[PDB]
Design a protein around this ligand. Structure first.
Ligand code: HEM
Ligand code: HEM
Lengths: 726, 726
């Protein structure tokens, strides 16, 4: 018996805020959170308490501290089958990581539609608002390995496995509404260009290197998604605060056989929010698991990630009514032209028990559709359909990957397929082929119909010759980048210029930088000049005269493309650092902590060492972390209560904590003598927007801080942050 | 043609300093650097210039930009064999990463002994000072994945494959002279404890989490290597500036059959040097590939990593003469007791061509020894001999891993083994067994002998019963941690205290922190009290009264255990930042670059944007990076020449660059009006040791800066840095 007597080794099985308890497997932290897929995994969950340690053959082990040897200082014997089983299993623990999106974080949840969509699709999981479909969701980056950092600049994946009563449907999307390339045949070229370069395998988790920009300069179809990556969309605050998109146009098919074109969306109910680049880059160093942590701790707190599924629907007769091709995955459909119709809500409310078994082995593939859905001829989607089935045969060891527990359907599955490595199902059918008479032809085909029918593809007309040719309708590359640029606020446009400037500064061959600036001059002259100025490049008179591309169907902006132009901030689940001193004003801290608790905002109490400090009135305050241990990077705002400020006033760490928060545009609130820190961040006597200051933390002090938190960051401070060395 | 007409896409095939040219495959950068192993890989090197693009079956491809479809907006066709081969290969690119040491960086080189060692060993590679043995060396971290960061706190691996004329010898070592655990049976327990925790797979590249410290608190044998890991040994400046050790006692066997015990050492001829923790942790964010890049760029510059192989030799009759067991890999042999005898030199002088083919697929294993070497009963070494053979079967896809080009011997190999996945060798032997008459028994066994003989194990006497028992002589856990602590300088001791304090502050369960401070009180009460203070923990009276462990064979300290107590600096290959302004004083820059060039020290010219600036005499200075883009973390020292200092005097990023370099103890040199920056870092007029200043950058200014650089860091500044908010 090695646990403490007080039981402090074990986290409470109740919702608790980040940092309050050690994290734990989902079925131990939240045993009463259930859904049909979580219940169906019970057959393979293994406990541990009160059981003997055994070999994998069930033989109890007496001494798991030593190898068998001839004498206590002698050679190890080959007959030690307990050592060789344990080391054999260790030696073969790893499987290949995913070729792309190897870094990702996943959770269980459930989906429900708001109303029946039976008029536009026969998909069973969208047929009834009282029908709940379990989900498993993995969010990811694209380029880095499974051990790379979370808050890199990159596109993010957003993959949802829906365990429906008519089959698994995987909606395998990203956090931007287009992809970099048009035809799947180029996907190995693009991904080899963005990945670490092959001689030396550098850089990890970064597209800021010469081969990426060489490919982008030579393939202008990439510029639209490059604009989104260089914007603050490339550095989300959390997986909870990004959008999701299926990117391709797919089809919905109803029971009458009508096809409707659809593009899929996820709206984050916590709103849209991103970091700023210096904060994201530094956070890759101080906490490379920040998004994985934030997701797992939000679910442990009850701050469940919620998203609304929405559809952009285009009738079949409107296929050719836009300036861009619906089948081109480098084009978005502006919401000003085709609004997103709300379809249902997904809540992620339980973490896995074992990351390897459930996250690392999950397999999502966009060819996993159900009756009521179908594909289109988008040539990127069409090649994806080949790739996901193929890659799973080597990543997951053979063709029985659907029998790995996380991947199993919850609905029935029966067919004539047999054998393969690690075959689990033992088929009793006398027949392994059809047609058969010896089992009266079971399992049998099922015709298509309104519900519970077999899958049949929509009978789209195909006409043309066998060609390796890009459609001419796809040959336009600059209008959607320009629409995106013009839809951004002025501070978002500055952050884009800064993204391209920093990236191209890391390209060693200067001609590649000059070729990219030339492509920017085809999108918007203001953007091109601002990036050229940061690179020491002067645009030629020819570049200054390139005519801008046309508007997209008459639009010169669409605010739904901006993260911030239309406020959608939500503070629940955010976190505030509170900088303690050795004699805190207990009344300020009561007022601060209860205001945050009332709005579901978490707090972390920080000091210059661990342990406790005692307040003016004797209240013992427990310290969560030190100023260096939990830097401002990890929080959304900073509060300094009054008390003995001279304890921390000359602490370089405390001062730099405020300077870094200030540089990264975070709200800061200073009570009482904590206003002496105004000198550190150069605030005027009369104050400035974004810094909350009062004689105490009472009256309106907390409401003002919370108002700033709802607007996420203090964008008006951007011109002021340069006169700070931080 | 897509290359620029000026040829600036291609790096010069000559030695160039870091950043002067794009990096490149080794055989293109240094085509005239050869050794027998490098030449033997020519059968599988494949070029590219002037060749047609083909499928893997040799069919020329006409259009690599499109899939075959029925009409240019039609569905992709199954008969597109060119798309499916290209995407099948991409879908199967990944193989499992190594179970430990997944993150690593490698190079080719050569070794030769200084004199014949035939009186102590019959190993052929140590027999002749003029017979050179090619090597391939991989350096690595332990815990993180292949995509994790380089400058984490961790142990580093140092594995060397010697391609000898009597077989491959792999010396598979680490950068500290002991390991964490005593018996291989516990390796999966230890590694699971240090690795990301199984529920959520956090944290990457960090031992600062509950399960690692839970295991250490319950297994005091771990304490010795934990002291090394918490010291600055855990954060090397470069793989060129750390020690190597084989850890175990092995045997040397001479031609007369005499056995000598040996421990292996690598001494870095560039000297020992480490980062400081705040710098290391920030560098994991700003350049997670810093060590991989530094190694590659040192070899491209001709700053070839050099190491001296050394042996500690103990006669067989002295096995039991120390206070510790020679077969216990948690104990080191102090050099004051047994000196390291210099044996030979290894030079790494060429990078690979393809990182996956040569580094990712390399297989090192400490059971690959040759005649003239043998094992001992160290119970950690004994279990290693099973594991490397076993893990390579799944990582590298089967039992023919020795036929992957990097792993092949350069000497003959013939036997009766056949088949296995991806078998390359086509055996013509009519026999596949021996004894045979049908091929007159060839290939034939070879008796042991002085040279070119068969391998025979030393006939060690074995006497004991078959037991799973730890030798009582291994049950001492505190004397070697204490020897290490007492041998560090006072600043190195402060960094150890900080390393334990920072790590244990990240352990959520407070009782684990308490148990580890109790273990520290058994090593040294000053260490224990200093850690306990930073944790808010008070030592009990019983803890204050624990008797310190005995000296190790009379030693109070051994200065070979410190990185810094004995000066051993070498500045060649280090790097200075030079902060430019828009009217640099060309006379200062002349003097600076001349003095750096004379000592082999490289420079990086930095400014507030990219492009060029022009000096006072019209010299056009290309800018390597911005002040933000290449932070002070990446350099060894900073020089600010005179000129138009007003251009940069108020630049926040230039001021922060000096604040960070100052906090991280780096030398700073300020010429002329750059002395105005003394105010940012609070240097008195009279100056400060570690800041070089003068009216101009003459010979005397450069000699003072170079002297500071030879001492690596300005330790005397440590009391002054706590106040700087950086
Ligand atoms: C619209 C463009 C695409 C989007 C939105 C997309 C999205 C994703 C996502 C989110 C994942 C990770 C799923 C998980 O979390 O496990 C993934 C993995 C993958 N993607 Fe795609 N992808 C795109 C295009 C492509 C293309 C064109 C190909 C190849 C022709 C491709 C091949 C793969 C492969 C091989 C994997 C790893 C799958 C696994 O190992 O299970 N992707 N992609
Ligand atoms: C003295 C203690 C040890 C040292 C110095 C050591 C050093 C290393 C080094 C440097 C590597 C990486 C080689 C490379 O660059 O590819 C490595 C890999 C590995 N080690 Fe050890 N190790 C030790 C103990 C152990 C133990 C006790 C076991 C298991 C019984 C073990 C199992 C492995 C395995 C399975 C690999 C991966 C090998 C591969 O995939 O090719 N190590 N170790």
């Amino acid at each position: 018996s090695l646990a403490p007597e007080d039981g402090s080794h074990r986290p409470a099985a109740e919702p608790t805020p980040p940092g309050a308890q050690p994290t734990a497997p989902g079925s131990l932290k939240a045993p009463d959170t259930r859904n049909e897929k979580l219940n169906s995994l019970e057959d393979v969950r293994k406990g541990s308490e009160n059981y003997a340690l055994t070999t994998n053959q069930g033989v109890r082990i007496a001494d798991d501290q030593n190898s068998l040897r001839a004498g206590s200082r002698g050679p190890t014997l080959l007959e030690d089958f307990i050592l060789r089983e344990k080391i054999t299993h260790f030696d073969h623990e790893r499987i290949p990581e995913r070729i792309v999106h190897a870094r990702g974080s996943a959770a269980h949840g459930y989906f429900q539609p708001y109303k029946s969509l039976s008029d536009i699709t026969k998909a069973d999981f969208l047929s009834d608002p009282n029908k709940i479909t379990p989900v498993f969701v993995r969010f990811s980056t694209v380029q880095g390995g499974a051990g790379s950092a979370d808050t890199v600049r990159d596109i993010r994946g957003f993959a949802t496995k829906f365990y429906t009563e008519e089959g698994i449907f995987d909606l395998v999307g990203n956090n931007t509404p287009i992809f970099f390339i048009q035809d799947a045949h180029k996907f190995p070229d693009f991904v080899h260009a963005v990945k670490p370069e092959p001689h030396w395998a550098i850089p990890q988790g970064q597209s800021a290197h010469d081969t990426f920009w060489d490919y982008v300069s030579l393939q202008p179809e990439t510029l639209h998604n490059v604009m989104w990556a260089m914007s603050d969309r490339g550095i989300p605050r959390s997986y909870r605060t990004m959008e999701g998109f299926g990117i391709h146009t797919f089809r919905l098919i109803n029971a009458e056989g009508k096809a409707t074109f659809v593009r899929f969306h996820w709206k984050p109910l916590a709103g849209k929010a991103s970091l700023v680049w210096d904060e994201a880059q530094k956070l890759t160093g101080r906490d490379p698991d920040f998004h994985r942590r934030e997701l797992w701790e939000a679910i442990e707190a009850g701050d469940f990630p919620e998203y609304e599924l929405g559809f952009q629907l285009i009738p079949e007769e409107d296929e050719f009514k836009f300036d861009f091709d619906l089948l081109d995955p480098t084009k978005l459909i502006p919401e000003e032209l085709v609004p997103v119709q709300r379809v249902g809500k997904m809540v992620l409310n339980r973490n896995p028990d074992n990351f390897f078994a459930e996250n690392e082995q999950a397999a999502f593939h966009p060819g996993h559709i159900v009756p009521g859905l179908d594909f289109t001829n988008d040539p990127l989607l069409q090649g994806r359909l080949f790739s996901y089935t193929d890659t799973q045969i080597s990543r997951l060891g053979g063709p029985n990957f659907h029998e790995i527990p996380i991947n199993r359907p919850t609905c029935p599955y029966h067919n004539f397929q047999r054998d393969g490595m690690h075959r689990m199902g033992i088929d009793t059918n006398p027949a392994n082929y059809e047609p058969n008479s010896i089992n009266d032809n079971w399992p049998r085909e099922t015709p298509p119909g309104p519900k519970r029918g077999g899958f049949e593809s929509y009978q789209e007309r195909v006409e043309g010759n066998k060609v390796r040719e890009r459609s001419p309708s796809f040959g336009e590359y600059y209008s959607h980048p320009r629409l995106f640029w013009l839809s951004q606020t002025p501070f978002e446009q500055r952050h884009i210029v800064d993204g391209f400037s920093f990236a191209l500064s890391k390209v060693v061959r200067p001609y590649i930088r000059e070729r990219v600036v030339d492509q920017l001059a085809h999108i918007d002259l203001t953007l091109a000049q601002a990036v050229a100025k940061n690179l020491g490049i002067e645009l030629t008179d020819d570049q200054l005269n390139i005519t801008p591309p046309p508007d997209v169907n008459g639009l010169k902006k669409d605010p739904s493309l901006s993260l911030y132009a239309i406020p959608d901030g939500d503070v629940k689940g955010r976190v505030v650092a509170i900088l303690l001193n050795d004699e805190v004003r207990s009344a300020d801290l009561l007022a601060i902590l209860k205001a945050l608790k009332a709005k579901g905002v978490h707090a972390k109490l920080l000091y210059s060492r661990m342990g406790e400090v005692t307040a003016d009135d004797g209240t013992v305050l427990p310290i969560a972390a030190t100023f260096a241990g939990a830097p401002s990077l990890t929080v959304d705002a900073v509060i300094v209560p009054c008390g003995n400020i001279a304890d921390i006033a000359d602490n370089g760490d405390a001062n730099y904590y405020l300077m870094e928060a200030y540089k990264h545009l975070k709200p800061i609130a200073l009570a009482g003598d904590a206003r002496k820190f105004k000198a550190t961040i150069k605030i005027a006597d009369q104050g400035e927007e974004g810094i909350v200051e009062a004689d105490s933390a009472d009256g309106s002090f907390m409401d003002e801080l919370l108002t700033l938190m709802a607007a996420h960051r203090v964008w008006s401070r951007i011109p002021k942050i340069d006169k700070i060395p931080a």
